Amino acid sequence: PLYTSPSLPNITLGLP
Amino acid sequence: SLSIHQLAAQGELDQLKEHLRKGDNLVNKPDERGFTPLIWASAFGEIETVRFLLEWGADPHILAKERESALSLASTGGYTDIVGLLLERDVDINIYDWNGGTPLLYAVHGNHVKCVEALLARGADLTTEADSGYTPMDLAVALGYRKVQQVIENHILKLFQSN
């Protein structure tokens, strides 16, 4: 059982 | 045979305690991406692990290789109580990472109303444009997150009054 790395999302994905 | 980071991530707290027996600088050991056990525990919402790590000497200020912080990882996951524990140790609330975010921007982006409220209550800045050209209110408006927008508004009204 290996959990995926801490990740920060792309906060303007889909935005102008 | 799980690493300290994985033990933290999975809330395997008894095993993590045994592993940190020595009480040396293991508690802050960064993995290959610079993530400490605290940043992994924060990312996965493992509050009792966070609490223990802070009590054992974990440095909540450490930034990983791309400037990720325990605070930002907690904010993106909406872990308001972890955010609070970290803010108690006076971490930088306006940490700008190389992904173009801040704790407040992640809380807005995740529609984490109570997280936004916590960060604002501790004085998170609203006045600054992210690399993307969005202030936090700009982003709440663009995403149509009206509850977040209201919390931001409530806060902004308090700011121009000193009495």
From Swiss-Prot, chain A:
<feature type="modified residue" description="Phosphoserine">
    <location>
        <position position="7"/>
    </location>
</feature>
<comment type="function">
    <text>Responsible for the deacetylation of lysine residues on the N-terminal part of the core histones (H2A, H2B, H3 and H4). Histone deacetylation gives a tag for epigenetic repression and plays an important role in transcriptional regulation, cell cycle progression and developmental events. Histone deacetylases act via the formation of large multiprotein complexes. Involved in muscle maturation via its interaction with the myocyte enhancer factors such as MEF2A, MEF2C and MEF2D. Involved in the MTA1-mediated epigenetic regulation of ESR1 expression in breast cancer.</text>
</comment>
<comment type="subunit">
    <text>Homodimer. Homodimerization via its N-terminal domain. Interacts with MEF2A. Interacts with MEF2C and MEF2D. Interacts with AHRR. Interacts with NR2C1. Interacts with HDAC7. Interacts with a 14-3-3 chaperone proteins in a phosphorylation dependent manner. Interacts with 14-3-3 protein YWHAB. Interacts with BTBD14B. Interacts with KDM5B. Interacts with MYOCD. Interacts with MORC2. Interacts (via PxLPxI/L motif) with ANKRA2 (via ankyrin repeats). Interacts with CUL7 (as part of the 3M complex); negatively regulated by ANKRA2. Interacts with EP300 in the presence of TFAP2C.</text>
</comment>
<protein>
    <recommendedName>
        <fullName>Histone deacetylase 4</fullName>
    </recommendedName>
</protein>
<feature type="short sequence motif" description="PxLPxI/L motif; mediates interaction with ANKRA2 and 14-3-3 proteins">
    <location>
        <begin position="6"/>
        <end position="11"/>
    </location>
</feature>
<comment type="similarity">
    <text>Belongs to the histone deacetylase family. HD type 2 subfamily.</text>
</comment>
Swiss-Prot record, chain B:
<comment type="subunit">
    <text>Forms homodimers. The RFX heterotetrameric complex consists of 2 molecules of RFX5 and one each of RFXAP and RFX-B/RFXANK; with each subunit representing a separate complementation group. Interacts (via ankyrin repeats) with RFX5 (via PxLPxI/L motif); the interaction is direct. RFX forms cooperative DNA binding complexes with X2BP and CBF/NF-Y. RFX associates with CIITA to form an active transcriptional complex. Interacts with RAF1. Interacts (via ankyrin repeats) with RFX7 (via PxLPxI/L motif).</text>
</comment>
<dbReference type="GO" id="GO:0005829">
    <property type="term" value="C:cytosol"/>
</dbReference>
<keyword id="KW-0010">Activator</keyword>
<feature type="repeat" description="ANK 4">
    <location>
        <begin position="99"/>
        <end position="128"/>
    </location>
</feature>
<dbReference type="GO" id="GO:0045171">
    <property type="term" value="C:intercellular bridge"/>
</dbReference>
<dbReference type="GO" id="GO:0003677">
    <property type="term" value="F:DNA binding"/>
</dbReference>
<dbReference type="GO" id="GO:0045348">
    <property type="term" value="P:positive regulation of MHC class II biosynthetic process"/>
</dbReference>
<comment type="function">
    <text>Activates transcription from class II MHC promoters. Activation requires the activity of the MHC class II transactivator/CIITA. May regulate other genes in the cell. RFX binds the X1 box of MHC-II promoters. May also potentiate the activation of RAF1.</text>
</comment>
<keyword id="KW-0539">Nucleus</keyword>
<keyword id="KW-0804">Transcription</keyword>
<dbReference type="GO" id="GO:0090575">
    <property type="term" value="C:RNA polymerase II transcription regulator complex"/>
</dbReference>
<feature type="repeat" description="ANK 5">
    <location>
        <begin position="132"/>
        <end position="161"/>
    </location>
</feature>
<keyword id="KW-0805">Transcription regulation</keyword>
<feature type="repeat" description="ANK 2">
    <location>
        <begin position="33"/>
        <end position="62"/>
    </location>
</feature>
<keyword id="KW-0040">ANK repeat</keyword>
<keyword id="KW-0238">DNA-binding</keyword>
<keyword id="KW-0225">Disease variant</keyword>
<feature type="repeat" description="ANK 1">
    <location>
        <begin position="1"/>
        <end position="28"/>
    </location>
</feature>
<feature type="repeat" description="ANK 3">
    <location>
        <begin position="66"/>
        <end position="95"/>
    </location>
</feature>
<keyword id="KW-0677">Repeat</keyword>
<dbReference type="GO" id="GO:0005654">
    <property type="term" value="C:nucleoplasm"/>
</dbReference>
<comment type="function">
    <text>Isoform 2 is not involved in the positive regulation of MHC class II genes.</text>
</comment>
